[PDB]
Amino acid sequence: EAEAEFLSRTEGDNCTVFDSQAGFSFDLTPLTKKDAYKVETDKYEFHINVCGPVSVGACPPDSGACQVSRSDRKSWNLGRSNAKLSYYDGMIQLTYRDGTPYNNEKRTPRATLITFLCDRDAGVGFPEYQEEDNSTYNFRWYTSYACP
Incomplete structure (x- = not known):
């Protein structure tokens, strides 16, 4: 399986995204x-943190997303520090680095994919954990900063 079929992805480098189709530029830096x-x-x-690394005491500073089992105190890396914002037709998505892969034949990195959803007036935004399934953890982020 491939990460998206690639239909309208505007990928940036730093945590700011300008989409040529959408004609809107979004700064997710306050996030x-x-x-x-x-x-x-x-x-x-x-x-998890939008852009850069995450400063949690459960994972190294070079990680941008970290999960820890509050039950076993196990912690895993959900992607190393990165700032790649992608704008997908419809929503903004952030993909993190390889971090730490599961234990599968594919050597699949546990990564975080944050899907930003339009919320007309919220604030900085609150992320919610939806589904790890595609070997990447998807979170939805309701933020006004992702909406035109």
Whole structure:
């Protein structure tokens, strides 16, 4: 399986994205936090940051997204520091680096894909953990900064 069929992806380098189709430029830099964001589940938390690295005490500073089992205290790397914002027709998505791969034959990196959704008036935004399934962890982020 391939990561997207590639239909309208505008990929930036730093955590700012300008999409030529959409004609709008979005800065997701205020969304970057040193303290970072934490999504909590029953037995795990996902701590992620938009752009750069994540400063969690569960994973090395070179990580941009880190999860830790609040149950076992196991922690995994969900991608090393990166700032690649991609604008996908419809929503903005951020893809993180290889970090730490599972244990599969494909050597598949546990990565974080943050899908930014339009929320007309919210604030900086709150991410929510949706589905790890595509070997990458997808979070939805409701932020006004992702909406025109």
